[PDB]
Design a protein around this ligand. Structure first.
Ligand SMILES: *[C@@H]1O[C@H](CO)[C@@H](O[C@@H]2O[C@H](CO)[C@@H](O[C@@H]3O[C@H](CO)[C@@H](O)[C@H](O[C@H]4O[C@H](CO)[C@@H](O)[C@H](O)[C@@H]4O)[C@@H]3O)[C@H](O)[C@H]2NC(C)=O)[C@H](O)[C@H]1NC(C)=O
Ligand SMILES: *[C@@H]1O[C@H](CO)[C@@H](O[C@@H]2O[C@H](CO)[C@@H](O[C@@H]3O[C@H](CO)[C@@H](O)[C@H](O[C@H]4O[C@H](CO)[C@@H](O)[C@H](O)[C@@H]4O)[C@@H]3O)[C@H](O)[C@H]2NC(C)=O)[C@H](O)[C@H]1NC(C)=O
Ligand SMILES: *[C@@H]1O[C@H](CO)[C@@H](O[C@@H]2O[C@H](CO)[C@@H](O[C@@H]3O[C@H](CO)[C@@H](O)[C@H](O[C@H]4O[C@H](CO)[C@@H](O)[C@H](O)[C@@H]4O)[C@@H]3O)[C@H](O)[C@H]2NC(C)=O)[C@H](O)[C@H]1NC(C)=O
Ligand SMILES: *[C@@H]1O[C@H](CO)[C@@H](O[C@@H]2O[C@H](CO)[C@@H](O[C@@H]3O[C@H](CO)[C@@H](O)[C@H](O[C@H]4O[C@H](CO)[C@@H](O)[C@H](O)[C@@H]4O)[C@@H]3O)[C@H](O)[C@H]2NC(C)=O)[C@H](O)[C@H]1NC(C)=O
Ligand SMILES: *[C@@H]1O[C@H](CO)[C@@H](O[C@@H]2O[C@H](CO)[C@@H](O)[C@H](O)[C@H]2NC(C)=O)[C@H](O)[C@H]1NC(C)=O
Ligand SMILES: *[C@@H]1O[C@H](CO)[C@@H](O[C@@H]2O[C@H](CO)[C@@H](O)[C@H](O)[C@H]2NC(C)=O)[C@H](O)[C@H]1NC(C)=O
Ligand SMILES: *[C@@H]1O[C@H](CO)[C@@H](O[C@@H]2O[C@H](CO)[C@@H](O)[C@H](O)[C@H]2NC(C)=O)[C@H](O)[C@H]1NC(C)=O
Ligand code: ZMR
Ligand code: ZMR
Ligand code: ZMR
Ligand code: ZMR
Ligand code: NAG
Ligand code: CA
Ligand code: CA
Ligand code: CA
Ligand code: CA
Lengths: 388, 388, 388, 388
């Protein structure tokens, strides 16, 4: 078994095709299924796995009460083959209320963060053993991607933040070899706030589209040089911005360099990726709430400031249904690297108060060079049918 | 691991022997079990798997209500080892309300159709990654086999239809290499309506017996040339016809060439295969309803128009019990290729209205050159014992 | 991987030590667990599996009602790693209300009998595919061992009976190569009724201790020559007899040759094996009912007619608790072949009428050359705590 | 695959980082989960497993009533991958109310004790088969480590005791090769009572920190010479003692040689390990009850009698929460052997009488050379939410 290098060109795509769906919430009404949030997907060279942060409880369980909260000691990282719902046989890979995972071609790396808000611990687990750990550097909720990290030639990279959720924070990029932290680079560039990066291999480096929770509804970009550990950052040029909340399409802006100061505070994890001058991106359909989900290509979305010409739109989840987090993952094909994405379908609180829990299912799409039609693939549970 | 060629003679058989049964519905009354329909079986070179289209819910679950419907966004393709019932640990292989799967000797191919009736998407997943996709070509419920596809020397073929369920439609035959569509041939020959083909290797080609939902209660045949992609089609010669509904045996006809125009509209997925001039086939015992299941050999059933001399009949499910879809699968033996079949045993609506759900179990038989007795292997659930 | 030959001497044992227990019935009161009976154990060269005949239902399930009956179409052979209780993820290996299984060193053979009492079918499944089948030869409940078959040098043998349960029947010994029946030998010798043989490798042949359901409370012996297919039979010499019912120790007899005509009608599956002139055997503690279970060595029990000197007794299940079937299995060690046994612990009807079902758990012991103490390892469920 | 030698230096650590947590009890309130106690962790060269002694029942089950008791015939050793909670698919590895397991690089050894208090049997199972057994030598509850044994170059060692729980007993050290007992050494040295040793490889030998249930609240040490089978023993030098009950830190003592006679009777399984003159250890936070859990390094804790200078303290479980047993396990890294530990989190009786059962979950930490923060990772179940 050899290290992944991801040294193939990016697959040229025409859009995305249905890949997976787990129906977690529908099943929870007739079976013992984990309460989760912050899911993601990552694949070893052979097969794909679905991940999520458990809440230390199943849904039909009095412990499901008040699971809207983000951080408790009982949250653990769950890992199943993609499409296997989180049943009671699911392995809890580590303790985590924030995480990132990736396979370097030989073994799995898991980055798991847990403990006190003001003094958290990140554990680094590789090939099934704890290899390293680091403590909070800013004493304010050390946190990471909530989607896959990326490895090239045996070095995995992950983006981590510690500090204010509504102001300048301390973001660092780690380089990890077989679970051992070998280098840490400070964030550099023009991005002013970085959270929950959705990263992907772009040989010879790694590129990330993240969440600015402070002043931007445009998404920050973090570029990682795997050769000399140097870091650059900016913002996605597209005038059709990807965060939520955000202004409507007719009044949104991005200059590629600065946070737009348009409903900048708060946000949601998301993704986008470049193709030459163009940009493929997803976002919630609603501009103010985590409702609906759409993807499209923005012409000049990567290179041209404030570009707003889109094409190849697809509805993933219609705007009558709840969405949530979304993130990218990459899958190596015979001759090219394909881009896929998942979306978290959040049910329960705070939006749906009939129940006292908060959980999610997922739906997953992959880049295609073929053709496709239309549809909508929401969570599908009837809130009135659920144990409260 | 080498590609399958299926280049062995067909096993000579005297009938069929019991192979598998999952007791899905009986178990659903005391356990969390998926609601399904449209099951099938396919085997890799080592072992067999049972497949089915889930309804995104378990049976003892309020979401089981009104699962009689064929197409919702939450249907996914399930896959377990044969004889492992669809419990909550079952892997959902892809999103699909119509599907076909097959192993080429190296990896699994999955053809998964989902989305809007008028604009569906078929995803092609090979070796655990999405490789290709195609959109609806006639904007009227793109649909496929609901049983195993067939691969020879690295090329897998599958039959798909788009268009009217009760009139001329657009049927195409796809040739797929490692998940990539390399050629598409239009249907040719005298078959006038093609649905839900049950295909099997007949080296050097592939042969399919299908469902004519328009004018024929005789089953159409599709012959696929894997070498030059040419297509031929006709109808099973046997005067004992295999569709449901159909005329009684004394007034049924087939001329090998045209739909018989006898209770031709509607139908059910089924199978048959040739042995020289003779035909082995199954069908429901009832001529108008999906009740009972019987197999027999028709002497001259392949070569002689309107032949009605049968022998070696076996009851699989007696006519007091519900059946449903049936399909063929092929298993490679030491010196010959054996033919097997499964029978879908539908319970619930529309026939059984005490409950509000629709689901199924399966029973499976394989060709034998030995001897055997008699029996009946129905679903076995007591509708009165079921959660409604 | 090479065929098993079992060409090592039998391990010299001092008695038996605890090996496994599944607690099936206790768990059934708080979890979804298969209803079973007629369990056994068999191991591949690496590890051991527990088998049983399911009743097509879990215990906490209205379908568990009236499962005291021996034969329905929904019974299937279940197979898990030893110690894994029959949960809903259990694989149903074949359709069977009577069975036998064994591994020849390369793959698993399953002999599965189902269908009508008067016209049953035995299916032979090898390496995951149906290879052969035979129909009933006496039209009266074709039946087999309910414990492991035995393979030497690629040839597996199994004992089958068809005909009266209370009079002369038609017993045959099959020889099977990779699932294919290659020879069938009639029973020969002085055994007058043969059922449910517990067989073991005794290189170069196979030896079986069985159940005479007609005239003997002494257990029949069947000796199988794997070289020329010849068959011999007799009765265990020991004056301490192994069947239930039987006379008490002071009035029981065996002459090694004929059924003793002592409470000979009815019986229970059991086991014993020879060591030189001596015999190791198990039996129920009660002489009339399937209660308790004990093992001991009879001095001269193999060679001396009516020998009644025992030593090294061990209580496996005390006489205040229900037992049932028991059988032998053999495990290859570094330098010798060890003998182990399981016992079926039957709960429910007909003995316990508070519940309407019949099921079992198991306890398993293996031969030891070391030392050991005392105990009792019954089912352990409180009948009053059970779903009825 | 080669035998383990553990011939690498001990990893230098700065403390411990979060590794695993199973949330057993929270899950038991909404799912079918085994009732357990006496858990531990052990890893093969690739991955880690969690073990525990089942009570032959799930928690939401009437059989969970009165499971506070230590020894019943239905207790079996459970084994899952670490982080997989004990669901119904869990393998019961052997019958046991006391156990120890370890992997020698090639296969698993299991030491399983069950049967009558006065006449127990220890079974030795290696590579999936029973290889040896030994009977009770003092007729008073033969018992062992309840944590991993240790193997070097194909020889595994385990510590066992038989005799008084509150007086002089008979402790022996077994050396086992491929499941076969090759030598037994009597305890020697100054330790006066030995139970439940937590052992670890310290090449070329093995070192154990145990429980003195008679006169010491200081923990006994047992040193095992794997080359000549010689045994030495003493007591942990640290004046900060590790047993419960114990004197408070101001009035506790140890002289490295003798039991301290400070609240010496009773106790709890625990651990510690040396690093030069220093000691890393864990213990309950409460000095009289199994509540809370803390780790720290004692400067001179290994070499200096009565040393009480600690540093690098970490709270694992705060003193408002129940703990229980704890034990060490060792994990081979690229260049060093790391030390890890688990903590048993006991819920139910006798401390919490709303419920009638006794069970536990686990939390697991591994040594780190990196940095870390603070937290508390208790069981987390709400006793009021539990089935009683
Ligand atoms: C069957 O399915 C196919 C494939 O999904 C589908 O074709 C697609 O239609 C959409 C919508 O027309 C196309 O995407 C659009 O492209 C135009 C540029 O040509 C953009 O201007 C559009 O964006 C505007 O309109 C959107 C609403 O449609 C707004 O949300 C957005 O803010 C803009 O105002 C949009 O991106 C897409 O390019 C094609 N795909 C392909 C490959 O042709 C087809 O319509 C379906 N057929 C039917 C009748 O259902
Ligand atoms: C024990 O089991 C064996 C094996 O199943 C069984 O033998 C089989 O009997 C059936 C029924 O007689 C045979 O099948 C028939 O073959 C004749 C030609 O010889 C056909 O004419 C029959 O078809 C007509 O009758 C059917 C009803 O039986 C109608 O449904 C049909 O429309 C036709 O009118 C039928 O195909 C079969 O050939 C044998 N199998 C073998 C290998 O011998 C035997 O009867 C069983 N014994 C008992 C008493 O259960
Ligand atoms: C601790 O455990 C050991 C191992 O189990 C145990 O030693 C065993 O005791 C039994 C009972 O005494 C021995 O078996 C007996 O052997 C004598 C011949 O020496 C037979 O006569 C006995 O059979 C008669 O008695 C039985 C009841 O005990 C009747 O059921 C039977 O019908 C006969 O009347 C019986 O087989 C056995 O040999 C030893 N095992 C060894 C290896 O020594 C020991 O007793 C236990 N200690 C205590 C005090 O519990
Ligand atoms: C963020 O996390 C870090 C890492 O956990 C943490 O630093 C640690 O603080 C503890 C507590 O001060 C240190 O442990 C102490 O070490 C001193 C010697 O230097 C000992 O005297 C202490 O023992 C006494 O006090 C204990 C209570 O704190 C008593 O229980 C005990 O009986 C003694 O009286 C204790 O061992 C530890 O060394 C550091 N760790 C490192 C690596 O620096 C830090 O405090 C956290 N920050 C916050 C604000 O949460
Ligand atoms: C399954 O769903 C159906 C449809 O909603 C339910 O039946 C309906 O119940 C409503 C409310 O009482 C009635 O007003 C309608 O007349 C019913 N519809 C039909 C078509 O009969 C039914 O209750 C559900 N089944 C279960 C078991 O909950
Ligand atoms: C198991 O099945 C039997 C047979 O139906 C049930 O016993 C019968 O119950 C009916 C209706 O409740 C009574 O009228 C009959 O008197 C019973 N028949 C017999 C033979 O006693 C029994 O109730 C079922 N058990 C459970 C728990 O459902
Ligand atoms: C657990 O078992 C105990 C003991 O049987 C039960 O408590 C007893 O109940 C009986 C009958 O009601 C009383 O007479 C005794 O006084 C009780 N014993 C004790 C020690 O209190 C208890 O009910 C069981 N728990 C549950 C939830 O079923
Ligand atoms: C570590 C932590 O709690 N991270 C958060 C996160 C966070 O609050 C913001 O991004 C602000 O910094 O946002 C939210 C959110 O849904 O917006 C979920 C996360 N939940 C978990 N990761 N557990
Ligand atoms: C795609 C789809 O909905 N196909 C159908 C199918 C169909 O309606 C006819 O064949 C007419 O074209 O028939 C039936 C049927 O039970 O008759 C089940 C199917 N259900 C599913 N495949 N889900
Ligand atoms: C095939 C069949 O029904 N065999 C029987 C069996 C049998 O009735 C006698 O041995 C008489 O011939 O006995 C019993 C019994 O417990 O005695 C269980 C079996 N149950 C099952 N094997 N399913
Ligand atoms: C074999 C046995 O029953 N051992 C004990 C044990 C024991 O009583 C003492 O150490 C004194 O000898 O302590 C306790 C304990 O929680 O204190 C748990 C054990 N339970 C089990 N191992 N099952
Ligand atoms: C959840 O907890 C809240 C706050 O304690 C309580 O008011 C509510 O009743 C709980 N919900 C359920 C379903 O028990
Ligand atoms: Ca924002
Ligand atoms: Ca038709
Ligand atoms: Ca008898
Ligand atoms: Ca003590």
């Amino acid at each position: 078994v050899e290290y992944r290098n991801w040294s193939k060109p990016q697959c040229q795509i025409t859009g995305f095709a249905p890949f997976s769906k787990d129906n977690s919430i529908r099943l929870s009404a007739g079976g013992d299924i984990w309460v989760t949030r912050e899911p993601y997907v990552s694949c070893d060279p052979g097969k794909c796995y679905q991940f999520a942060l458990g809440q230390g409880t199943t849904l039909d369980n009095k412990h499901s009460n008040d699971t809207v909260h983000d951080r408790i000691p009982h949250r653990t990282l769950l890992m199943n083959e993609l499409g296997v719902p989180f049943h009671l046989g699911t392995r809890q890979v580590c303790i985590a209320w924030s995480s990132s995972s990736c396979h370097d071609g030989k073994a799995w790396l898991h980055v798991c963060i847990t403990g006190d808000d003001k003094n958290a611990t990140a554990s680094f687990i590789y090939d099934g053993r704890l290899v390293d750990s680091i403590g909070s550097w800013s004493q304010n909720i050390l946190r990471t991607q909530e989607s896959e990290c990326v490895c090239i030639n045996g070095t995995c990279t992950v983006v981590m933040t510690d500090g204010s959720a509504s102001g300048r924070a301390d973001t660092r990029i780690l380089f990890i070899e077989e679970g051992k932290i070998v280098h840490i680079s400070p964030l550099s560039g023009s991005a002013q706030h970085i959270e929950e990066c959705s990263c992907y291999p772009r040989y010879p480096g790694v590129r990330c589209i993240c969440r600015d929770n402070w002043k931007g509804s445009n998404r920050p970009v973090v570029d990682i040089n795997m050769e000399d550990y140097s870091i650059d950052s900016s913002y996605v040029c597209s005038g059709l911005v990807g965060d939520t909340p955000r202004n409507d399409d007719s009044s949104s802006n991005s200059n590629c360099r600065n946070p737009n100061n348009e409903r900048g505070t708060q946000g949601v994890k998301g993704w986008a990726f470049d193709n030459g001058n163009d940009l493929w991106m997803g976002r919630t359909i609603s501009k103010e709430s985590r409702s609906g989900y759409e993807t499209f290509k923005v012409i000049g979305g990567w290179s041209t400031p404030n570009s707003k010409s889109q094409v190849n739109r697809q509805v993933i989840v219609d705007n009558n249904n709840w969405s949530g987090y979304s993130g990218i993952f990459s899958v190596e094909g015979k001759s090219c690297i394909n881009r896929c994405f998942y979306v978290e379908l959040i049910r329960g609180r705070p939006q749906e108060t009939r129940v006292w829990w908060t959980s999610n299912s997922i739906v997953v799409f992959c880049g295609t060079s073929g053709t496709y039609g239309t549809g909508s693939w929401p969570d599908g549970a009837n809130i009135n049918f659920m144990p409260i």
